[PDB]
Design brief:
5-stranded mixed sheet; 2 domains; D-Maltodextrin-Binding Protein, domain 2; 14 strands; homotetramer; alpha+beta; Inositol_monophosphatase_CS (chains A, B, C, D)
C-alpha cells in the first residue's frame, strides 16, 4: 500500500547510492564496538532515507542504528547498510533495511539488496513478497534436507557449525542479517540463527518471515518480542530441532 | 580471444538454462550421502557444454565432475553447477566453471554465476577480468582486517572458524568453490581455503587468482596446479599466516 | 492473487528459456529464414506455459483450443515472444505476455521482458505494478510535452510521425507492442498507437494501462477490449488529440 | 588497458548516480524546474568523471560535453547523459559515453547504459567488446533483411521512415545516439543514421563500430571526421544502399 510502496521505492532509490561506493570505500572506522565497522556511506545513505520519511511523514519518529534514536506510536526503523563489511569488501550480500512499527507492533518491513536486485518485503496481513511475487517458507521437514545459516559470532559460530554440519546439508554464513532472515521467508534457507544482537536490527526480517509462514522465537522457543536478544528464524517445521541444538551450543560455551 | 571468448559466451548461454530450474528442482539424488547431491539439470547443463566443445574442438579432451573423464595434451575441465545445493535451495551463489588445460597447465579459466550475472575469467599472461574489467587481489596485509572464506566440510569447518575467528574480521561460507576462489582474484575476499577437492571445482579458480596477483598452494605451501587435494587461495600478502592456522586446524584434527 | 502470482512466476521462468537463444541465432539461420528456429522457440515456450496452465487451471480455455467467444467464456492468452525481430537481431526490447480474459474482459495481464528484467502486471481492481512497486500513467497533459510511440508499420508510421513531429516532443519506435503498451501504464511514454495488430498480442498491456489510470480505445474512440480492431493507449490526459491525428492519418492512407 | 579499464570502471561507477534519479523527476518537482534538476545530475556526474580523470591523468585536456572546447594532444571527451529525454521519462535507453583522443585520433571508446547494464567499448587495434565478450557488426547483406535506425529529427525522421520503410525490414527509434551507434558494432542494428549532431557526442561510438568491423561515413560516403555533420553507422555490407536512400530523403527536404 501507501507506506509499503513508499518504502520499496525509497530503498531501491537509495540502493543506487550504495552501488556507487560498493567496494570502493575510503573512510572505514570501527563503530560502537570493535568487531564491526562503519563508513561515511552508511550515514549518507541514512541521511537520504531519513530526509524522505520526514518529508512525507512529518509527525513520525525514526530510529537508526547510529544517529537518530526516537520512540513513538509511529516509528520507522532504519539500518542504512546491513553487511557493512561485505559492502566495504565488495561482496554483494549487503542490504538496506526499513521497518514501520505502529502502536508497538511491526506493520511492515522491507529489505533491499542493491547489488542483487532483491527487494523482499511484507505488511502484516498481506503475505510476503519478493520483487512482486509471493514467497513462502520451505517444506523441508527434517534437518537432513535443510540448509541453515547463522551470523559470525565469536565462540558461537564455530561450535554451532560444529554440531550442525553433522545433521544438515550445509550451513551458510552470508554476512547480512536482514537479508538472511528474509531468505528464510523466501525459502532459500530453512533456518537462521543470530546471537547477541540488537532486536530492532531484525524487525523487517521478522515480519517478512512471519508473513512468509515462518516461526520466529528466542533461543528459548518463546515468541520473539522487543525484549529478546537472540533470535531463531525458521520454516516452523524444524524449529524445535534447531532450538534444542542451539541450547547445546550456548551451554558448551558456558 | 578465441578460446576465452568462446568459453565466456558458452557459459553465459548455458547459465540461462540453469536459471530456468533455479530453486525449482523436483528431484535431487544423493551421490554418496545426504550432504553430497547432484541433479538432472547438472547433466543437461554439462551435455550442452560438452556438445559445444566437441563441435569446435573435436579432437580435444573433456573432463567433467561426472560423466566424462578424458586425459590429454588439450583438456577442457568442466563443472556444470558448482554449488548444486545452493542451486536447489534457490540461493544465488552457484556457478558454471570451465578451464582449458594445455600440457597440464591451465591456460584460461572462466567462472560464471547466472543468478548474479558475474563472469570472472583469466587467460595465461593476459590478467584477470570481471565482466570485461580488470581485477586484482586485495591489498590487505593484516589478517585482522581480512575476510576469509571456506567450504562446508564436516569437522574441519567448525574448527577452522573457531581458530580463524579471533584472528580475522569475518569468515564467509557462500557455497560455490569456483566462485569463492574467483572472488579472491576479485579482491572480494582476502583468502579462500578448500579441504578435499577436485580439479573441476578449482582449475578455473587457480588461473583467475594467479593472473590476479594472488597465491595458490596446497596446505603445505607448495605451488600446486591441476590438483593436490588441499588448496589455499589468497592475495599473497597473508598466505603464510593462513597456512599456519590451516596446519594448526588440520593437525588439531587428524 | 492465485492467478496473478502463478503468471508472474511462470513468465519469469519461461523468459529464461528465451534468453538461451536470444541473439544467439547464428547467421546461417538469419540468412536461410530465421522463421523456423523462431517457431521452435515459440512452440517450446508456449508448451511450457500451456503445460502449467493445464496443471493448475484444467477446465479453462487456453488460446481458443475450445473456441473463440467474445462473451461468456474464460480464456488465457499466450504470446511466447513479442518483438521477434528485436529478439532475432539481439535487441533487449522483446517480451513474453500472459493474459486471462473473462467475458471479453482482461481480468489480469503480465508482460515480461526477460532481457530487461522487467515484469509489468495488473489484476482487475488491484492496480498496476512493476516488479513489486506501483506504476501509474504520466501527468503530461499537453501533446507538445509528451513522448509518443508507434510501431514500424508501412504507410502509417511515416505519416504518423510527420504529424506528431511538431505537435509532440519525441516519437519512439521500440519494436515491442506489449512492452510498449505496458510502458504507457508505467508512465515511460505518454501514448502508444497500434496499426493492424493481433489484439491478443496486447491484451495484457490493455489491463496494465487501465489499472495504471490511463485509457485504451480503438480508433473510433470506443473503450477497447481483447477483440478490438485497433488500439490507442495513453495517460488519459491527451487521448482525444491522439485519436484525432490517428484518424487524420488513417484518412490520408486508406 | 590502463585508460580503457579506467574508463569502463569510471562509467560503471557514475552510472549508479544516474540510476538514483532515473525516471525520478516526478510532477511534484517537475512543476519546480525539472530541466534544472536534470542539469544538476549532469553536472554532478560530469564532476565525478572529471575529478577522477584529473586525479589519474592530471595534465590532460577534458572537453566535457557541457564544458569547454579545450585543445591539445591528449583529450578526454565526456557526455554524462546521452538520451536525456528518455532519462527524464524513465526509458532505459540512455547512456554515458567517454572517448579518449590522442594526436587527433580517438584511441578508445566506452558507452555505458546504466539501466541496462550494457558496457560497450573498444581500443584502437584491439577490437570491440560488450561486457567482456567480442562484438562484431552483423552479416546482413541486403537492406530488406536489415533493421535500421535513426533519431527523432523534425523534417527528417518522417521522410526517412517513409523512404526506408519499403526497402528495409524494420526501422527503430530508440533515443540514444551513442548507445544506438554502439549497437551497430554489437550487431543489434545493421545501420544507424544521425542528423546534425556534434561529432564529439558520437566519438565513442565511432571507434566501437569500426573496431567491430563496421563502417562509419558522413552522408556523402567518405570517412567520417570532425568536418562531418551527419553520420551513417553500418556493418559495411549495405552502406552504399543506405547512403543512396538517405540522400533521397535529403533531397525531399530541400
Amino acid at each position: 500500500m501507501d507506506r509499503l510502496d513508499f518504502s520499496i521505492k525509497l530503498l531501491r532509490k537509495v540502493g543506487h547510492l550504495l552501488m556507487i561506493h560498493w567496494g570502493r570505500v575510503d573512510n572505514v572506522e570501527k563503530k560502537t564496538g570493535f568487531k564491526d565497522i562503519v563508513t561515511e556511506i552508511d550515514r549518507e545513505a541514512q541521511r537520504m532515507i531519513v530526509d524522505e520519511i520526514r518529508k512525507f511523514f512529518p509527525d513520525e519518529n525514526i530510529m537508526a542504528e547510529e544517529g537518530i534514536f526516537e520512540k513513538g506510536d509511529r516509528l520507522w526503523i532504519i539500518d542504512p547498510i546491513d553487511g557493512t563489511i561485505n559492502f566495504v569488501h565488495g561482496l554483494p550480500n549487503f542490504s538496506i533495511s526499513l521497518a514501520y512499527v505502529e502502536n508497538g507492533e511491526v506493520k511492515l518491513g522491507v529489505v533491499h539488496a542493491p547489488a542483487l536486485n532483491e527487494t523482499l518485503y511484507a505488511e502484516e496481513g498481506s503475505g510476503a513478497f519478493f520483487n512482486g511475487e509471493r514467497i513462502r517458507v520451505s517444506e523441508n521437514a527434517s534437518l537432513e534436507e535443510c540448509v541453515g545459516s547463522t551470523g559470525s559470532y565469536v565462540d558461537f559460530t564455530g561450535k554451532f557449525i560444529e554440531r550442525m554440519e553433522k545433521r544438515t546439508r550445509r550451513i551458510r554464513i552470508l554476512g547480512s542479517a536482514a537479508l538472511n532472515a528474509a531468505y528464510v521467508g523466501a525459502g532459500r534457507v530453512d533456518f537462521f540463527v543470530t546471537w547477541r544482537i540488537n532486536p530492532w536490527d531484525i524487525a523487517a526480517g521478522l515480519i517478512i518471515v512471519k508473513e512468509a509462514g515462518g516461526m520466529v522465537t528466542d533461543f528459548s522457543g518463546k515468541e520473539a518480542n522487543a525484549f529478546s536478544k537472540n533470535f531463531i528464524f525458521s520454516n516452523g517445521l524444524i524449529h524445535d530441532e534447531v532450538v534444542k541444538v542451539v541450547n547445546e551450543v550456548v551451554e558448551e560455551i558456558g
